Ligand binder design. Structure first.
Ligand SMILES: CC(=O)N[C@@H]1[C@@H](O)[C@H](O[C@@H]2O[C@H](CO)[C@@H](O)[C@H](O)[C@H]2NC(C)=O)[C@@H](CO)O[C@H]1O
Length: 365
């Protein structure tokens, strides 16, 4: 099976021990390492950090310690927006500029493939035509990669994309049917289903729906998302179940009511290391003294709370489960976001190195 794990640029800036660099990457923990992120400048693939070139060298260097390992460069993300994307795909001449810069950029730093993270084709201010163009981008990259390998005699570069679990976004700009055939594999980011952007407490990545929960909110869970993509026409072998190594927090209305789906005034206060409201890294979560861990029967997932803070995350057991669901449905493997967010150096969870992801590696084989 495949174990796809994301590495992020900005992790290098975390203070204290939370600092993450390639040096902290275990070359054997995952089957595929993905670098987040790479930008675009003049329809061309280009770095985004002052020391990306040195990092690209380290990241891909791991392959000397494990030749079986595969690395891919990811372009986009949430903050990337859609402007630069929609532009690049509008005209075949700018599109071809990209396809070519891709092939050169990747071959220059030793990347085995490229991960497309357009969020999202035909959404967030993206013409409903981009849905079609995205397919064209996928097909173009696909052909170029197929051609290049034949004339260069090197291992064909890989092409994957990070797709959404959001019913809307899905039907909004993804020709599942078609793209699924030009992508080596599909990373379903089955997380962020619920968040501080809802005035009522919810869980980040829920496996199934709550017994007392329906309507459109019945789609907001892993299973639903997973069954969706499979039906739309994605062979399961090419479907990678993404899993979060972070959780989502809410500042409760009153420490009196902590019912999953309780009134929340807003996002949980920010963590000491990640420093972002409504978001907590696993290693920060398990740092809660006198917390109150709990589980959601319906949707096999925990969540702790202390006073007015309520954070829904995944722990070792919730990962064991999901890996199990994964296998059950016959999926191609698991995908994890993100490396730097697990307790990568066992400095606060008291569970060793990469607690969450190691559980994945174990169960997967
Ligand atoms: C492929 C993927 O997971 N894409 C999304 C991620 O980019 C996103 O991570 C968030 O990225 C922002 C910049 O792109 C960061 O500022 C932000 O801190 C970071 N948040 C987290 C929790 O890593 C994740 C998270 O929601 O969602 C993906 O859809």
């Amino acid at each position: 099976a495949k174990l796809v794990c994301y590495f992020t640029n900005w992790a290098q800036y975390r203070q204290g021990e939370a600092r993450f660099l390639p040096k902290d990457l275990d070359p054997s923990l995952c089957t595929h390492l993905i670098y987040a992120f790479a930008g675009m400048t003049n329809h061309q693939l280009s770095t985004t950090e002052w020391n990306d070139e040195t990092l690209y060298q380290e990241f891909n260097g791991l392959k000397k310690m494990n030749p079986k390992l595969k690395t891919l460069l990811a372009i986009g993300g949430w903050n990337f927006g859609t402007q630069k994307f929609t532009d690049m795909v509008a005209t075949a001449n700018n599109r071809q500029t990209f396809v070519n810069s891709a092939i050169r950029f990747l071959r220059k730093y030793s990347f085995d493939g490229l991960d497309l993270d357009w969020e999202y084709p035909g959404s967030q201010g993206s013409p409903a035509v981009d849905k079609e163009r995205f397919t064209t981008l996928v097909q173009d990259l696909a052909n170029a990669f197929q051609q290049e390998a034949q004339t260069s005699g090197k291992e064909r570069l890989l092409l994957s994309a990070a797709v959404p679990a959001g019913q809307t976004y899905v039907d909004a700009g993804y020709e599942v049917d078609k793209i699924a055939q030009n992508l080596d594999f599909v990373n379903l980011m089955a997380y962020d289903f619920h968040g501080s952007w809802e005035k009522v407490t919810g869980h980040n990545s829920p496996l199934y729906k709550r017994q007392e929960e329906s309507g459109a909110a019945a789609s907001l869970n892993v299973d639903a998302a997973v069954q969706q993509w499979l039906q739309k026409g994605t062979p399961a072998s090419k479907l990678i179940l993404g899993m979060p190594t972070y959780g989502r927090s809410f500042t409760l209305a009153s420490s009196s009511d902590t019912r999953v789906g309780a009134p929340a005034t807003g996002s949980g206060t920010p963590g000491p290391f990640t420093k972002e409201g409504g978001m907590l890294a696993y290693y920060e979560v398990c740092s809660w003294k006198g917390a109150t861990k709990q589980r959601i029967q319906d949707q096999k997932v925990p969540y702790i709370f202390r006073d007015n803070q309520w954070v829904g995350f995944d722990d070792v057991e919730s990962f064991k489960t999901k890996v199990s669901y994964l296998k059950q449905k016959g999926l191609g493997g698991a995908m994890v976001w993100a490396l730097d967010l697990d307790d990568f150096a066992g400095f606060s969870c008291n569970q060793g190195r990469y607690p969450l992801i190691q559980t994945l590696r174990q169960e997967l084989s």
